[PDB]
Amino acid sequence: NSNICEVCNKWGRLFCCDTCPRSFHEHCHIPSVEANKNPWSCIFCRIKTIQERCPESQSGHQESEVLMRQMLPEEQLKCEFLLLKVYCDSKSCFFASEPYYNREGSQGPQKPMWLNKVKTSLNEQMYTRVEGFVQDMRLIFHNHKEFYREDKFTRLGIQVQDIFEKNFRNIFAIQETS
């Protein structure tokens, strides 16, 4: 197995996947690495299994159909994996914890949002459809773009949104378009 966390790329107290060489800090894996379970399979492996069981799940889908899906166990897992893929980028640090807003010429957003809040919301089964999860994720980046206006720091929101959107299209097998 790897000797660094797949998510944050640091060593430490690591839990090793039994079916692939990845390793994880306890609270870097989503969901948090389970207490017992021998063997244990990581989220990457669990997602691969879904695909392998239903090859047709990789045919193209419309975004509007995906968003309306209820959060049954497979869709719960897919959103946990998509959230984890965002944390995998180091620029997620900017969006992880609760933001505050005090900048001359700007007003903070009406509905602040951050990654750890989405993480808690998934853990607590607060989303009933994929749409709820995707709306809160996109809100993170939209709040950032609006607040930072023409400061070059706005780009960090474009960058992490692009990681989110690419991973959304991959995980949920969104139909490719030009």
Using CB under 5 A, list all residues that contact Zn ion.
5, 7-8, 17, 20, 22, 25, 28, 42, 44-45, 54
SS3 of residue 60 by DSSP: coil
For Zn ion, give the closer residue by CB, 5 or 134: 5
CB of 47 to Zn ion, least distance (A): 9
Shortest CB 171 distance to Zn ion, Å = 16
Residue whose C-alpha is closest to residue 139's, from 108, 114, 162: 114
**In this complex, which beta carbon is closest to Zn ion, that of residue 66 or of residue 134?**
66
H helix runs in the chain, sequence order: 43-53, 63-68, 73-87, 93-96, 115-123, 130-148, 154-171
Nearest residue (CB) to Zn ion, 5 versus 113: 5
Nearest approach, Cβ of residue 64 and Zn ion (Å): 22
- C-alpha 106/C-alpha 38 separation (Å) is 52
Q: Minimum CB separation from Zn ion for residue 167, in Å?
A: 17
SS3 call for 172? coil
CB of 149 vs Zn ion, minimal distance in Å:
33
* Residues 129, 69 contacting (CB under 8 angstroms): yes
C-beta separation of 19 from 45 below 8 A: yes
Residue nearer to Zn ion on the CB measure, 56 or 150: 56
Toward Zn ion, which CB reaches closer, 87 or 127? Answer: 87
CB proximity list for 131: less than 8 A, separation 6 or greater: 67, 68
CB contact at 8 A, 7 and 28: yes
